[PDB]
Amino acid sequence: SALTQPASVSGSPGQSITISCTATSSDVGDYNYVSWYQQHPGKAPKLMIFEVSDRPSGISNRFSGSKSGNTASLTISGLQAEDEADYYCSSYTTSSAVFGGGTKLTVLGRTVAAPSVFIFPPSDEQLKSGTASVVCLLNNFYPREAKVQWKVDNALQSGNSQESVTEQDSKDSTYSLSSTLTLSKADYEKHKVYACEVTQGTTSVTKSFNRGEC
Amino acid sequence: QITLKESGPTLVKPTQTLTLTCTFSGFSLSISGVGVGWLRQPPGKALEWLALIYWDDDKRYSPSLKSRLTISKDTSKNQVVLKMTNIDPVDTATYYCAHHSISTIFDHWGQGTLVTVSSASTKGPSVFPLAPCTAALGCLVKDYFPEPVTVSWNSGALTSGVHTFPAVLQSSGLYSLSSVVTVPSSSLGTKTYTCNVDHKPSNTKVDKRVHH
Amino acid sequence: NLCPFGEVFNATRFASVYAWNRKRISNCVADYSVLYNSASFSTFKCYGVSPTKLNDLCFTNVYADSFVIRGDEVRQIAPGQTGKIADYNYKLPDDFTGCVIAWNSNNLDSKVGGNYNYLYRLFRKSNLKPFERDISTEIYQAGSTPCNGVEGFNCYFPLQSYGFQPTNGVGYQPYRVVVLSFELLHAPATVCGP
Ligand SMILES: *[C@@H]1O[C@H](CO)[C@@H](O)[C@H](O)[C@H]1NC(C)=O
Structure with missing residues (x-):
């Protein structure tokens, strides 16, 4: 500021x-x-x-x-x-x-490990209650720095997600991270493509799903 | 040695007034050029200064929060009190008190006191499956209060490759977290996966079977 | 018997320039070696005496005047000077015998959001005479209409605050000042060096 x-x-x-x-x-x-x-x-x-x-x-x-x-x-x-x-x-x-x-x-205390990325759509059980949570998992990566961006029908999201990180693994020193996008059921049903883009150095990996197809 | 220690409530509801006390020792808040400040740090966010009081009782406040902040000192009790009116969920933070001199800005910070702002009463969690459209499965443990919940998989027999993320306090005043487990795509058709969520505060246990 | 210079230079509270403090220093050994050893001072100007031969001089009386001003006003603490300080707060005579010592006190006299404790006399009907003190708070009648102790158009309060900010440049930071006056009368000396 x-x-x-x-x-x-x-x-x-x-x-x-x-x-x-x-x-x-x-x-x-x-x-x-x-x-x-x-x-x-x-x-x-x-x-x-x-x-x-x-x-x-x-x-x-x-x-x-x-x-x-x-x-x-x-x-x-x-x-x-x-x-x-x-x-x-x-x-x-x-x-x-x-x-x-x-x-x-x-x-840096070890080599770079790229995350394995997974996207999870909200369950139908949650949708009945009026809220949709879309989760992105970044598994076993190193170092801690990672940029996670949510895109809904290719529009970059802001202010509607929260990140959470595990403690460093005692054996391999890796981290794991979850990013959760929170939408109302109505807003979730307005779009088709849900994508989570993970950037680490020279690589960006986008994992996505189309609503309705699962 | 110069020491400062924060004390006060760990949980406050919105609209209420948060009162924090700083008990100091090792120095006098009478000597010229000395002050005591109150700062805060929301979880995962930057340090932010709230208020400051000098040896001569001159008070300084953050211009954006001045209307809700009131600082005071009690020379006899070695206490510096901060009162924050109309508390809001965004006021959940670790509150720190520190020794002030113009030269150092702030030195000898206290350990801090995490203050949670929530209107929520005791609530057990809702458990939703995390499944895709080597596989990864999990459970979203949503909307519970207060902390904590414990998560296990297959009654404790599945520990390898399990990541249970720490809780985050949502804007609703309720906690949320995910627990994931990385499984093989070959064994995901014969072996089944259940997450066991225990929330002792509300005597609630949830077992959610997750389909690969 | 050591002179109480520490009681003046190392004092906890310093005076506002308009109500400047004075300590009479008498019947003692003035070791200026403690003040020459201190790297805190950014101004050491002597008039009518030599700073190197100060540990040799003997005086009938010594006067230590102390106060706080802005850094750019330190030039006013000299004989024959003009400005709001020399004119309305602290005046030195043209025939001045003594030293003027100043040092930056931003670490003590500045505050977050400004320190307004220190004041200076902004208005006065006439200039002060050498070593005259004026601590009056009577409303200045700048205009023709009588004020009658009330503030209004052309009826201002005589004192103004400095407002020392830690963001200011070196010239706008507070400075602690000590003025040493040396009285050399045709009578025995009470203050001598080592
Ligand atoms: C003021 O105290 C400091 C030590 O805190 C010392 O170095 C200095 O000489 C003292 N000043 C005088 C005039 O004795």
């Missing part, structure tokens, strides 16, 4: 990565107070960098901050597995303490 960050960044152990934070407006003024937070799952945010480049006591020297104009950057050198977390930048506007949208950082 007031600050923009890439949704995700990835690297391999030992490498350096950079996360940007661009101020979208003049409201940040001089943009001197820029803080960076590391957030591990289920944990509280942790201050890594403050005032663009200062490091609190106890924070590794692998984390560094800098700024060029309206863009602040967090650089992490000698990337380690424990560095995989959400990173948020923060600053001030003339009225508020603002945050960027967050950047999920991935430290």
